[PDB]
Amino acid sequence: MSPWERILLEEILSEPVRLVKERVRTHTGRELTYVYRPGPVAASFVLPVTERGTALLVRQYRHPTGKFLLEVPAGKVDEGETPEAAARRELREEVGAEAETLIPLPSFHPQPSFTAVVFHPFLALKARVVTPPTLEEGELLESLELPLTEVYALLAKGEIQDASTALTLFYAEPHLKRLGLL
Amino acid sequence: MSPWERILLEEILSEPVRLVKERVRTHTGRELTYVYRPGPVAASFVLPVTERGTALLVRQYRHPTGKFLLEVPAGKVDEGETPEAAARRELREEVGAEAETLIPLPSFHPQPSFTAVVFHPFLALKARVVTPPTLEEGELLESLELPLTEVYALLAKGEIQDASTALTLFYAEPHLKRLGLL
Numbered sequence: 001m002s003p004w005e006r007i008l009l010e011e012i013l014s015e016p017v018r019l020v021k022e023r024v025r026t027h028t029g030r031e032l033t034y035v036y037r038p039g040p041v042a043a044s045f046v047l048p049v050t051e052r053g054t055a056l057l058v059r060q061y062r063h064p065t066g067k068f069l070l071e072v073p074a075g076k077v078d079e080g081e082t083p084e085a086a087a088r089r090e091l092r093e094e095v096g097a098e099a100e101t102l103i104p105l106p107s108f109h110p111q112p113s114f115t116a117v118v119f120h121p122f123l124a125l126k127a128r129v130v131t132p133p134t135l136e137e138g139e140l141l142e143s144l145e146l147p148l149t150e151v152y153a154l155l156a157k158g159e160i161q162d163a164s165t166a167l168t169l170f171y172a173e174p175h176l177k178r179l180g181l182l
Numbered sequence: 183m184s185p186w187e188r189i190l191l192e193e194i195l196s197e198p199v200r201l202v203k204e205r206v207r208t209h210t211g212r213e214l215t216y217v218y219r220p221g222p223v224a225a226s227f228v229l230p231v232t233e234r235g236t237a238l239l240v241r242q243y244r245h246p247t248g249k250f251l252l253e254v255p256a257g258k259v260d261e262g263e264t265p266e267a268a269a270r271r272e273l274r275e276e277v278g279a280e281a282e283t284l285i286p287l288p289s290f291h292p293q294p295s296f297t298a299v300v301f302h303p304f305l306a307l308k309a310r311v312v313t314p315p316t317l318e319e320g321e322l323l324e325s326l327e328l329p330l331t332e333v334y335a336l337l338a339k340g341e342i343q344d345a346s347t348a349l350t351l352f353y354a355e356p357h358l359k360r361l362g363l364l
């Protein structure tokens with residue numbers, strides 16, 4: 001029961017990102033061209049907290065912004081993979097870490113005006129580094145460790161620029177306080 | 183001092199959204215094709231709160247997701263427009279409302295892996311409807327009014343799916359409590 005009717009869907013690019021340009025007939029009966037990254041597609045974001053109340057984060061180059069951003073480890077959910085499995089896999093690839101319990105947090109659409117992608121945040125407990133990272137060609141980042149108090153001070157000061165990381169931290173906060181880690 | 187060198191930048195689309203495919207030489211010295219929405223580009227998001235402690239929100243169709251989402255009014259910052267002016271303009275266009283003070287909240291990148299866009303959140307005080315909305319062709323939404331207690335209950339329950347709206351609410355919360363509106 002979509003309010004907009006498909007006239008024609010054109011694929012603008014298939015790789016490395018799929019992008020479409022769709023001609024639709026809108027609620028006004030007129031035509032409009034809408035450009036977007038089609039679904040279904042998802043990514044998992046994971047805040048890895050150690051038993052010492054610290055977080056394992058990454059400082060990662062994000063080319064579209066030209067900046068290195070402080071982020072929680074994250075990555076695309078592969079075909080047939082569950083969000084939790086992608087979270088654990090990306091945590092191992094980007095930080096070389098494993099964790100015990102993963103508490104799922106509220107999923108969200110980072111930019112629904114342009115992409116169908118759903119981001120799945122998780123709070124990983126008893127995180128620990130166990131192996132060297134295995135980064136993809138295209139991934140330029142370094143992992144670091146910060147006390148949770150410092151990470152949340154950065155959040156309060158408005159210094160966390162990556163939206164997904166900021167939101168994951170806000171959703172994780174009550175759990176961290178409940179568990180006695182913050 | 184970018185870690186990646188431009189080999190060639192190709193424009194994939196110019197309108198309604200500008201998209202590029204850039205061939206770069208990475209930190210490994212190898213080539214990679216990176217697809218993204220180039221900057222500089224920005225949008226403003228504004229949580230409009232009334233003197234009665236209610237919020238003026240929108241339920242808007244977001245085609246890439248196929249869903250109607252509960253969001254704060256928001257829109258692109260036009261050429262030569264300041265983020266605050268875009269916030270006031272979009273608030274008037276989408277909800278037919280005006281406000282007094284606008285408190286700027288921490289800016290953020292909704293999806294730095296794909297777009298350079300910076301989102302600028304604001305908390306607008308003494309919001310009030312004064313005129314009919316003036317929606318663009320392509321904008322399918324309705325405005326509504328909800329008590330702040332209900333909006334924040336939805337946030338806590340993980341029911342706010344739009345990331346930018348969720349983050350704006352989290353950043354606005356301390357200000358609302360300070361001002362006595364929550």
Ligand SMILES: Nc1ncnc2c1ncn2[C@@H]1O[C@H](COP(=O)(O)CP(=O)(O)OC[C@H]2O[C@@H](O)[C@H](O)[C@H]2O)[C@@H](O)[C@H]1O
Binds near residue numbers: 073117
């Ligand atoms: N826009 C792009 N264009 C070309 N190549 C790209 C792009 N985005 C990511 N890559 C490649 O993603 C890799 C392994 O990535 P994730 O660790 O899986 C990816 P993560 O990068 O942390 O991102 C999460 C998300 O933001 C959204 O754009 C995505 O849906 C998403 O997965 C890198 O080596 C990048 O070069």
Ligand SMILES: Nc1ncnc2c1ncn2[C@@H]1O[C@H](COP(=O)(O)CP(=O)(O)OC[C@H]2O[C@@H](O)[C@H](O)[C@H]2O)[C@@H](O)[C@H]1O
Binds near residue numbers: 033257258299
């Ligand atoms: N991907 C798209 N493809 C084709 N047409 C589009 C697209 N996105 C928005 N529009 C048009 O934006 C209008 C006026 O929009 P905003 O009220 O200005 C826009 P807002 O829609 O609320 O969005 C804020 C943001 O999310 C990010 O994608 C943007 O940078 C951004 O501005 C609508 O009528 C849409 O059809």
Ligand SMILES: [Mg+2]
Binds near residue numbers: 073075076
């Ligand atoms: Mg990643």
Ligand SMILES: [Mg+2]
Binds near residue numbers: 075090
């Ligand atoms: Mg990956």
Ligand SMILES: [Mg+2]
Binds near residue numbers: 074075136139
């Ligand atoms: Mg990765």
Ligand SMILES: [Mg+2]
Binds near residue numbers: 272
């Ligand atoms: Mg809008």
Ligand SMILES: [Mg+2]
Binds near residue numbers: 257258272
């Ligand atoms: Mg606009």
Ligand SMILES: [Mg+2]
Binds near residue numbers: 256257272275276318
């Ligand atoms: Mg608008």
